[PDB]
Design a protein around this ligand. Structure first.
Ligand SMILES: Nc1ncnc2c1ncn2[C@@H]1O[C@H](COP(=O)(O)OP(=O)(O)O)[C@@H](O)[C@H]1O
Ligand SMILES: Nc1ncnc2c1ncn2[C@@H]1O[C@H](COP(=O)(O)OP(=O)(O)O)[C@@H](O)[C@H]1O
Ligand SMILES: [Mg+2]
Ligand SMILES: [Mg+2]
Lengths: 14, 517
């Protein structure tokens, strides 16, 4: 859930 | 050890401290192995530029890091990171969270990530053809993992970091992914990889760091080691140059004089079985299970491995064929949801309190799996990895003729996997009982198994269970379908993967001998 994740994952994909 | 200059990061609301970092090198794969809670992902976040390390003080800039690494080959690495000359691509650990961070179809996301024009080649290698039109909300854990690896492989960069890519992948998918990841190093790129599957780590890596310490308290990166020495030192539990004995005993694999050939008596036979689920069909060839043996079960997922185990467990009825048995079965299911208001101690003591107080069970099962430290934990509050270990313990504490363990390595770290392998084997030897173990971790299969049962077919469409056969014949057949070979390591007795294109790999592929004992 941590907002660290949404940053890490979107960088890989977006 | 524990030097102040080597202190890389301290979490404030935790006090966990990380010492040292791994090397990264263009044209090389650097592998990282160690128990969870020791800073593996922390190191990846730092090298990726996602976390500015505080140097166990109050540093908050890359300038402070660059100065701290004076005279270290990482000094220039961090300068480049600071200036944006490098920007590592990170396949993170937490692939479960992908649906919360990203929306839409899979094909849309891989299109964006395509900076190399190899979309078709990557989709092929990771077998994502049937997933392209799916929306991310409807992907399995394993599909989320492969889409993440795919997106990382498609980016153009110099440094690629993969944190635990084998998670959720079947035996085929993890080995295929390892091959595809390693190909980055042949293109001159740098690869960092954290792995708990030792066969995959071995196959992946040119260089190895062992991470050691106390989970949740501190972790230390070893000096860089060659792949063979590193893994062998990990298994021995002693790092020679560092002079650190991090485990009070060695984890040994079978050397060729250890296990006596025994013509075992038949425990039970089973006839041809069929199980249909709508358009899916599993066909099981007639087979035999011997008294006191362990049969490892391997194959791609979606093929009927669990379905077969369930029929053996008596929780699923065959569509065609008849299981006629008067045996007691203990069953560790692949997926478990805790529904138990009580502690781990209460649960296990009510199965067999006498075994909890037995020195053999403490030594071979309870201590190695970390069960004693979980005793006063509520079962409903256990994590995936904790619940897995407790369920394995609970299963092995039962008195049964046959023990069925479906994918015990799931959610386990490398150290916990080795412990689980030893426990299964030692308890079955001790009590002269029979087990079947479905596993995707090759070193676990190699340690626990006397014979092997191979499943083949098309995921979701059809599966066929071959009769149990010898380890060599079984692994040859399976590995032929992947195109990877293993040799034996004389020092530790462990299976040792040959890297693609190596001389031993060629020799073995010509002879058709994919696996030695
Ligand atoms: N963001 C954070 N804040 C506080 N503590 C953390 C944070 N991330 C990790 N930790 C702690 O640091 C330790 C090591 O974490 P991690 O690097 O993820 O270990 P590994 O990847 O080897 O399992 C863990 O025990 C964890 O509790
Ligand atoms: N109760 C069920 N109803 C319908 N389909 C099922 C059921 N159980 C399993 N399947 C399907 O049967 C196939 C075999 O699944 P499983 O035996 O769990 O494979 P494995 O354990 O080898 O991954 C899969 O395609 C799965 O979706
Ligand atoms: Mg981690
Ligand atoms: Mg299964």
């Amino acid at each position: 859930s941590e907002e660290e994740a949404l940053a890490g994952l979107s960088a890989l994909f977006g | 050890s524990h030097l102040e200059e080597d202190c890389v990061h301290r979490y404030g609301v935790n006090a966990f401290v990380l010492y040292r970092l791994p090397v990264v090198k263009e044209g090389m794969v650097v592998g990282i192995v160690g128990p969870n809670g020791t800073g593996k992902s922390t190191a990846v976040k730092i090298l990726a530029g996602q976390l500015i390390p505080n140097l166990c003080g109050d540093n908050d800039s890359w300038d402070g890091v660059i100065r701290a690494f004076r005279g270290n080959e990482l000094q220039n690495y961090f300068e480049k990171l600071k200036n944006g000359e490098i920007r590592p691509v990170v396949k993170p650990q937490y692939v479960d969270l992908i649906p919360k961070a990203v929306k839409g179809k899979v094909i849309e996301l891989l299109k964006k990530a395509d900076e190399t024009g190899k979309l078709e080649e990557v989709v092929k290698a990771l077998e994502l053809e049937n997933v392209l039109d799916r929306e991310i909300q409807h992907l399995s854990g394993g599909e989320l993992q492969r889409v993440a690896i795919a997106a990382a492989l498609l980016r153009n960069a110099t440094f690629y970091f993969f944190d635990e890519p084998s998670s959720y992948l079947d035996i085929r998918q993890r080995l295929n992914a390892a091959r595809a990841i390693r190909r980055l190093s042949e293109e001159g790129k740098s690869v960092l990889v954290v792995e708990h599957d030792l066969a995959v780590l071995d196959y992946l890596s040119d260089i190895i760091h062992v991470v050691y310490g106390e989970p949740g308290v501190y972790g230390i990166f070893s000096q860089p080691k060659g792949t063979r020495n590193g893994i062998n030192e990990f298994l021995r539990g002693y790092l020679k140059d560092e002079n650190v004995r991090f485990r009070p005993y060695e984890i040994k694999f079978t050397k060729t004089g250890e296990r006596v050939e025994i013509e075992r008596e038949t425990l039970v036979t089973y006839p041809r079985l069929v199980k249909d689920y709508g358009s899916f069909r599993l066909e099981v060839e007639p087979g035999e299970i011997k008294k006191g043996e362990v049969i490892g079960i391997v194959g791609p997922n979606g093929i009927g491995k669990t379905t077969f185990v369930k029929m053996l467990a008596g929780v699923e009825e065959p569509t065609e064929g008849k299981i006629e048995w008067d045996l007691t079965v203990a069953y560790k299911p692949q997926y478990i949801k805790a529904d138990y208001e009580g502690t781990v101690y209460e649960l296990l003591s009510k199965i067999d309190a006498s075994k909890l107080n037995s020195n053999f069970y403490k030594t071979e099962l309870l201590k190695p799996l970390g069960i004693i430290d979980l005793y006063d934990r509520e079962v409903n509050e256990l994590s995936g990895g904790e619940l897995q270990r407790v369920a394995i313990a609970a299963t092995l504490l039962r008195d049964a003729d046959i023990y069925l363990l479906d994918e015990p390595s799931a959610y386990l770290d490398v150290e916990q996997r080795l412990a689980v392998s030893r426990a299964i084997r030692h308890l079955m030897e001790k009590n002269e009982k029979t087990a079947l173990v479905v596993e995707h971790d090759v070193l676990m299969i190699d340690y626990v198994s006397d014979r092997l049962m191979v499943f083949e077919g098309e995921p979701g469409k059809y599966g066929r269970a071959l009769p149990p056969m010898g380890m060599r014949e079984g692994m040859n057949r399976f590995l032929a379908s992947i195109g990877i070979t293993f040799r034996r390591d004389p020092d530790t007795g462990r299976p040792r993967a040959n890297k693609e294109g190596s001389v031993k790999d060629r020799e073995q592929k010509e002879k058709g001998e994919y696996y030695y004992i």
